[PDB]
Write a protein that binds this ligand. Structure first.
Ligand SMILES: Nc1ncnc2c1ncn2[C@@H]1O[C@H](COP(=O)(O)OP(=O)(O)OP(=O)(O)O)C[C@H]1O
Ligand SMILES: [Mg+2]
Ligand SMILES: [Zn+2]
Ligand SMILES: [Zn+2]
Lengths: 199, 343, 50, 65, 103, 197, 348, 148, 49
RNA sequence: CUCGCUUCGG
């Protein structure tokens, strides 16, 4: 009896797969035949074959889903900052205070190369920098670390250690990742959407 | 203590309930602190020994002590593949009427061992399908099955009705080429087993063919392998952590091989001891007994390899082991000569 | 099997083969092993240059 | 169809031990003790002889002759 | 054409070499690796098979100091040959006296 | 007369259809103490997803049967139980669960884990790589539409279906799509009048 | 002049599985000619094609134009399509017998002497890696015995040579993470890689598989380009099988046999569940059964019976997992996530 | 002397969460001179330890007592007077984490150093004064010697 | 259903459009009673490995 | 050859 019930369940699964294959095949054909015309133009506007505009900017932001590192966010700032700290640990430079970190971030962001970057990404970078500066301030307040750089136990400077070289590397890496995460013009956006929905 | 643990790690291979431990060879220079594991030819020559325990025709068993796993495995693999032998390669067929297909018949004929000594021949050159006296042998197989002129009225059994209805390998006749008749005394060149059933016939059917045998190594094809089974196993050493007596000692005698654990009445009570640890096969049935798990410690001696070499009858196994060692020496010599030529 | 779906949108091609696959871990992820028999059949027109 | 000459795994000559095996079955011997008397220690040759079916005579019953 | 040396890079440093041995397999590779690893001057010895289809092995030798990494190779080959000769002699003696005591 | 090779399909009487991926020499195969080297090495990873305990029980029963010269029964909702074959195995000197101490053929050193050895009834399938292997040159074409024929028996070429075209479009490879669907299949040169069309 | 040459090594060739679902079902590879009769490729690329080596046939097209060949190599290169366009997750990653091999290699139990570690590392020195210095890492334990941990051997894959600029960094939670250790989990399931060195944790599907991000190969692709990721994949596919074969990994009937504690627990759970089901049956049949909201009395009984049966099943599974010992191959393959799960183990 | 840290520890627990690994155990230890808690993974197969054992532990920047920090490579075959001659169990690792104590919300003075000897973890926690000289991405030697 | 093996005792005289035979078929070591009932062991379609 | 039909494979 148990064997018969198990076989019933197995045959249910098999017939489910059998019907699903054909149904999704037809849906895939319809979706691709409808969506294949669209293309991401060089003015960042998705246009149909006839020239009509479907979107003024793809995805509202213009970022590639294939290079989408986070959970529908271009970067995971914590991971990037940790990787920058580990790759370039500068042992000959002092750590930065909250005010120093904010000042150097504001100085770097106002350069020309960051102007072409989208304002939302700059706001997110500012928010993350403010959060990490608050973390640094909380740690130094907890352990009584002085921003003068003369606290006797130097190991206390290893708690939340950030240096201007690391800040510059992190900002340049984030800007480069954002620039390289944009839709390359001419990409077959519609076919990608059709396949990524049908599969 | 720590020294005992290190010694067990570097000398013994312990078999646990779920897995084996200390399987890797570790005695290398710099691996251990208090030991100088640098190569010493004198120490190796002092410690190494070979002891033959059983040797009849087509079967040899011997313990090698002091060698390592790599060299023992090299010897085993050379015996399995790199020892040249004599075997059938070419089959020329004249009117094979048998039910057995021609390709199947040729494959069966190739697997038949040949008693010819491989050292007296040479490898046939690339091409040269005709073959010369030096590097080939010819075997004629001509069997014509026909009804027995005198048989009983019923004769249900095929033996009485028919003659030559079973093509045994004794029907193979050696055909000398050139001066091979003078070099080899009669009866030396022949199929090894003399009783292998090649095919089965019915009256009217005939098998006429010639077989060209050439030298080859088991690496090229398994029909050239001289040894039926060439293997080695590490010598077991079962040890008792605490003295086991009473009926549990009889349980010990039943957990292991029949001949390894012996029970003796020293004071009228049965006490168990390791008699012949060699005979054990490590069925690991001592782990089923919950109480007896923690009283024994199954182990293998790392540098004690019992080699069992069962041959196919081409030549006695001692000559096979000698040829394997000489083949390893020849490989080393070939690469040394290449290195000298480079420099 | 009409012209549009069978002969226009998707059509049969030459210079192609179809074979059973087997694993091979010793190859790089960007490489594929091709049988010698297939390679002798599938040809590439190389233009003679300097 | 017919008994293989060699054992598949180990390679021991097993072709010559077939008909004699049948004799042990023509005698009173069981399968296991007949295999033991034939000298097949490891179970691969025992599988070779025990699981072999002799189709050669059944096919020969359909031979031209 | 059987054994070919290949230096670590275009700089031709003798400390790290790769010997490609043709028509060879794990037999000689493993035996030679064991016999050459016991040389104290070898930091890293290791053999690999390029592909099971082709019969060749790559041994890699990396020494400690300034050894040309060919000297340890030749020394390992010589030690393996001497070991094989000694075991052949000992095995022949064991076979012979076993036969003698049998009769 | 065909010999098994790479690509030949093999089954194991339990739905574990497989392809011969590699043919190693005998010496490279692992060996037990008795000297037995396996014919077929099958991956353990196929078991947990498919839960084919029947194959393991069949292997154990076959090992016991060949050891004691018997034919065990795997009858549905019955057959020989595990306890009896375990008792037969322990009586014959082998491990009561089939797992055996094994020495590595390559390195010559014992394996850290016991290996599950036993006779399994493997059956070869008619699907062979020799019959299935196909390669297509320019070859013949169809009269109606001058495209390569359909089947291997007719020396036909492979087909770029609609989804293959969709994937090529998604990649954006315009030149390769043009070459595949126009140049390499049914390229032609017609004469069109620019006046009447 | 045009010469119709044979397909030689290095030719860009399209390779496809005919049931095509997404664009990664067809890719451009580099052809290498081999004597056998089958199309062979690295198994880490099995997941995009959804191939399983059970007789599946694959198609192979040869572009006949330089422009088409270049487009195939650039746009459809395997190194250029490591991440699916649907959500950016890495598709080409380690698979069964690679997750298991790496998980066993990076376990805290592993300890190698110089010889075994040298052999395992030298297993990768083929092809383009023939021209690099090995850079054997310093041993971890050296005074009593000189031992290399498995994690160092695995980290050799990420950064083999001195001149390799790869410095991979990753910090994530494994499948069996307790949730409180934060790199001090009892199960050692918190993965931490600093400068291409495995500091803590054990490799598994969550970090080496094709599931989602936090994959080490995905980190390599996003930080150091495609070539480093492809080389790491090749080194893993060459190293893990060697160690797994030299170590031995087998499944037996005793690996799935139940213990005495599991039998007793299952018997007690079955008795209790059947008693509760009978009580519910009697409550519905004769009298008033407390009706769950939004459903009839019969549906309430069905829900209660399903709940009790699920209780029996999951408690039996918990008991069997608790009584199972380590090195149990089904349990090991379930922990690293290469194949199966705890539900399959409990069922079988 | 390159000794970054040195103290006598007593084991208070061997495996609080079970016998997880055959060769590796997770010792919990407390110091006598200071309140320095130690979480240390050790290989018991080669260097067995017990619940009541008391051992001297030294974390050193270099293995040579003369102060020569030249540790580009280590040769096991090299024989020379080194610190390891005075100890029984020497491991080599990297101090890969420095984390402040978060249990104390304010006015905290406790730190923790996480050192990974190839996956064998050591958390040395206590007063930040004793941890002076500890830096991330710094390679150290652990030397352990059991006492009577 | 697709297993390769012997067809019958007259498989040699029979001429079919496509026939697959096994060189050395062997009866299974673990045989169901259904195998005995249908006499499958007389015409095996596989080998024990 | 064309066409249909079945049986497969996946
Ligand atoms: N009708 C079909 N359409 C598309 N693909 C198919 C079809 N039939 C088989 N396939 C191919 O075979 C694969 C189906 O295997 P899958 O269903 O995942 O395992 P399975 O056949 O259930 O094996 P188990 O029963 O789980 O051992 C996936 C697909 O590429
Ligand atoms: Mg499939
Ligand atoms: Zn055999
Ligand atoms: Zn006109």
């Amino acid at each position: 009896t148990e064997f018969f019930f198990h076989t019933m369940a197995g045959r249910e699964g098999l017939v489910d797969t059998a019907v699903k294959t054909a149904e999704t095949g037809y849906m895939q054909r319809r979706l691709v035949k409808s969506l294949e015309d669209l293309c991401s133009q060089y003015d960042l506007t998705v246009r149909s074959s006839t020239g009509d505009i479907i979107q003024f900017i793809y995805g509202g932001d213009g970022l590639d889903p294939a290079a989408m590192e986070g959970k529908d966010e271009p970067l995971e700032f914590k991971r990037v900052l940790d990787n920058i700290k580990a790759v370039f640990p500068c042992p000959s430079e002092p750590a930065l205070s909250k005010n120093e970190l904010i000042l150097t971030t504001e100085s770097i962001m106002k350069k020309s190369e960051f102007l072409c970057c989208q304002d939302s990404f700059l706001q997110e970078i500012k928010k993350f920098i403010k959060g990490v500066s608050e973390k640094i301030k909380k740690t130094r307040d907890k352990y009584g670390i002085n921003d003068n750089g003369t606290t006797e136990p130097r190991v206390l400077y290893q708690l939340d250690r950030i240096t201007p070289t690391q800040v510059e590397k992190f900002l340049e890496t984030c800007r480069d990742k954002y620039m390289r995460a944009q839709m390359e013009p001419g990409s077959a956006v519609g076919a990608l959407c059709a396949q990524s929905i049908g599969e | 203590a720590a020294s005992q643990a290190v010694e067990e790690m570097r000398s013994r291979v312990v078999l646990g309930e779920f897995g084996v431990r200390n399987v890797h060879t570790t005695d290398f220079p710099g691996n251990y602190s208090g030991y100088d594991d640098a190569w010493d030819q004198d120490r190796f020559e002092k410690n190494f020994r070979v002891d033959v325990v059983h040797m009849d025709e087509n079967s040899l068993e011997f313990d090698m002590v002091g060698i390592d796993a790599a060299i023992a495995n090299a010897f085993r693999r050379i015996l399995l593949a790199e020892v040249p032998t004599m075997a059938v390669e070419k089959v020329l067929v004249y009117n094979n009427t048998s039910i057995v297909q021609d390709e199947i018949l040729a494959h069966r004929l190739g697997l038949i061992p040949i008693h010819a000594d491989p050292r007296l021949f040479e490898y046939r050159n690339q091409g040269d399908e005709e073959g010369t006296e030096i590097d080939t042998l010819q075997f004629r197989l001509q069997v014509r099955c026909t009804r027995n002129p005198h048989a009983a009225k019923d004769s249900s059994d095929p033996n009485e009705l028919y003659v030559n209805h079973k093509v045994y390998t004794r029907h193979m006749t050696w055909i000398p080429l050139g001066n091979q008749a003078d070099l080899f005394p009669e009866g030396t060149i022949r199929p090894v087993h003399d009783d292998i059933l090649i095919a089965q016939l019915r009256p009217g059917q005939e098998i006429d063919l010639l077989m060209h045998c050439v030298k080859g190594i088991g690496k090229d094809h398994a029909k050239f392998s001289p040894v039926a089974t060439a293997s080695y196993r590490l010598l077991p050493d079962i040890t008792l952590l605490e003295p086991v007596e009473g009926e549990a000692a009889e349980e010990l005698s039943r957990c292991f091989s029949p001949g390894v654990i012996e029970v003796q009445e020293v004071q009228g009570k049965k006490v168990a001891r390791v008699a012949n640890p060699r005979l054990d096969t490590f069925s690991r049935e001592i782990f089923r007994n919950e109480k007896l798990k923690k009283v024994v410690r199954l182990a293998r001696v790392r540098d004690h390899y019992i080699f069992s070499v069962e041959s196919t009858g081409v030549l006695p196994p001692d000559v096979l082991v000698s040829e394997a060692i000489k083949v390893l020496m020849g490989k080393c010599r070939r690469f040394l000569d290449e290195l000298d030529a480079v420099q | 099997q009409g012209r549009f779906r069978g002969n226009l949108s998707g059509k049969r091609v030459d210079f192609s083969g179809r074979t059973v696959i087997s694993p091979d871990p010793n190859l790089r992820i960007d490489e594929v092993a091709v049988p010698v028999h297939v390679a002798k059949i599938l040809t590439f027109p190389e233009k003679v240059n300097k | 169809m017919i008994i293989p000459v060699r054992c598949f795994t180990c390679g021991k000559i097993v072709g010559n031990k077939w008909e004699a095996y049948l004799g042990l079955l023509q005698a009173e011997y069981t399968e296991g003790d007949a295999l033991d008397a034939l000298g097949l220690k490891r179970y691969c040759c025992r599988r070779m002889l025990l699981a072999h079916v002799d189709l050669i005579e059944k096919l020969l019953n359909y031979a031209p002759l | 054409k059987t054994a070919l040396e290949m230096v670590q890079a275009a700089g031709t440093d003798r400390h790290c070499v790769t010997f490609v041995l043709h028509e060879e397999d794990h037999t000689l590779g493993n035996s030679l690796r064991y016999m050459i690893m016991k040389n104290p001057e070898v930091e890293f010895c290791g053999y690999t098979t390029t592909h099971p289809s082709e019969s060749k092995i790559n041994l890699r030798i990396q020494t400690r100091g300034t050894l040309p990494a060919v000297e340890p190779f030749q020394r390992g080959l010589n030690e393996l040959m001497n070991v094989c000769q000694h075991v052949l002699d000992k095995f022949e003696a064991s076979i012979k006296d076993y036969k003698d005591q049998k009769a | 007369t065909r010999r098994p090779e790479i690509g030949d399909k093999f089954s194991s009487r339990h739905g574990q259809k497989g392809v011969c991926g590699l043919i190693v020499p005998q010496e490279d195969m692992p060996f037990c103490d008795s000297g037995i080297c396996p014919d077929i090495i099958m991956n353990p990873h196929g078991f947990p997803s498919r839960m084919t305990v029947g194959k393991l029980i069949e292997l154990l029963a076959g090992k016991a049967g060949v050891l004691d010269g018997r034919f065990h029964y795997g009858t549905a909702f019955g057959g020989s139980k595990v306890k009896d074959v375990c008792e037969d195995l322990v009586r014959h000197g082998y491990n009561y669960l089939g797992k055996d101490y094994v020495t590595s053929g390559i390195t010559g050193e014992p394996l850290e884990a016991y290996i599950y050895f036993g006779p399994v009834y493997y059956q070869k399938l008619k699907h062979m790589v020799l019959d299935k292997m196909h390669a297509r040159a320019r070859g013949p074409r169809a009269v109606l539409t001058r495209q390569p024929t359909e089947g291997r028996s007719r020396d036909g070429g492979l087909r770029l279906g609609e989804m293959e075209r969709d994937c090529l479009i998604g990649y954006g490879a315009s030149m390769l799509l043009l070459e595949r669907l126009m140049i390499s299949s049914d390229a032609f040169e017609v004469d069109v009048c620019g006046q009447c069309g | 002049d045009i010469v119709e040459r044979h397909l030689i090594d290095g030719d860009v060739v399209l390779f496809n599985r005919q049931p095509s679902l997404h664009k990664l079902s067809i890719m451009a590879h580099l052809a290498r000619v081999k004597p056998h009769r089958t199309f062979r490729f690295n198994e880490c690329v099995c997941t995009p094609y959804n191939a399983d080596f059970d007789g599946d046939e694959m198609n192979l097209h040869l572009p006949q134009t330089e422009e088409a060949k270049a487009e195939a190599l650039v746009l459809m290169g395997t190194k250029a399509n490591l991440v699916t366009p649907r959500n950016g997750e890495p598709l080409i990653a380690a698979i069964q017998d690679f997750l298991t091999g790496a998980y066993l290699l990076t376990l805290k139990d592993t300890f190698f002497d110089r010889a075994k570690a040298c052999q395992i590392i030298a297993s990768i020195l083929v092809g383009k890696d023939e021209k690099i210095k090995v850079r054997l890492p310093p041993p971890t334990i050296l005074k009593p015995v000189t031992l290399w941990t498995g994690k160092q051997i695995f980290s050799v894959i990420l950064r083999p040579s001195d001149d390799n600029p790869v410095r991979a960094n990753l910090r994530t939670k494994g499948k069996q993470y307790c949730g409180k250790g934060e790199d001090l989990c009892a199960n050692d399931s918190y993965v931490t890689i600093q400068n291409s060195e495995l500091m803590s944790g054990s490799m598994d599907k969550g970090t080496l598989g094709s599931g989602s991000k936090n994959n080490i190969f995905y980190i390599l692709l996003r930080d150091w380009g495609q070539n480093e990721a492809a080389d790491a994949m090749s080194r893993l596919a060459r190293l893990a099988p060697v160690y797994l074969s030299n170590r031995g990994f087998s499944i037996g009937i005793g690996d799935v046999t139940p213990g005495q504690g599991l039998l007793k627990a299952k018997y007690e759970l079955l008795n209790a569940g059947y008693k509760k089901c009978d009580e519910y049956i009697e409550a519905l049949n004769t009298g008033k059964l407390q009706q769950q909201p939004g459903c009839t009395a019969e549906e309430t009984l069905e829900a209660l019976i399903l709940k009790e049966l699920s209780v029996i099943r999951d408690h039996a599974g918990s008991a069997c997992l608790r009584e199972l010992d380590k090195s149990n191959s089904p349990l090991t393959m379930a922990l690293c996530g290469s194949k199966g799960s705890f539900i399959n183990i409990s069922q079988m | 002397a390159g000794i970054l840290f040195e103290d006598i520890f007593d084991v208070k627990d061997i495996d609080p969460e079970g016998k997880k690994f055959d060769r590796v155990s997770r010792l919990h230890c407390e110091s006598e001179s200071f309140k320095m808690d130690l979480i240390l993974d050790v290989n018991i197969q080669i260097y067995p330890v017990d619940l009541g054992d008391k051992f001297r532990l030294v974390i050193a920047s270099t293995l040579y007592e003369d102060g020569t920090l030249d540790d580009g490579e280590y040769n096991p075959t090299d024989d020379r007077p080194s610190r390891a001659d005075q100890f029984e169990y020497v491991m080599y690792g990297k101090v890969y984490r420095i984390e402040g104590d978060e249990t104390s919300t304010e006015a905290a003075t406790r730190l923790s150093a996480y050192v990974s000897y190839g996956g064998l973890l050591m958390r040395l926690q206590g007063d930040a004064n004793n941890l002076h000289g500890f830096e991330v991405d710094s390679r150290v030697y652990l030397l352990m010697k059991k006492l009577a | 259903k697709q297993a390769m093996g012997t067809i019958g005792y007259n498989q040699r005289n029979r001429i079919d459009t496509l026939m697959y035979l096994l060189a050395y078929p062997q009866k299974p070591m673990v045989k169901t009673k259904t195998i005995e009932l249908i006499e499958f062991e007389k015409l095996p379609a596989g080998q024990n490995a």
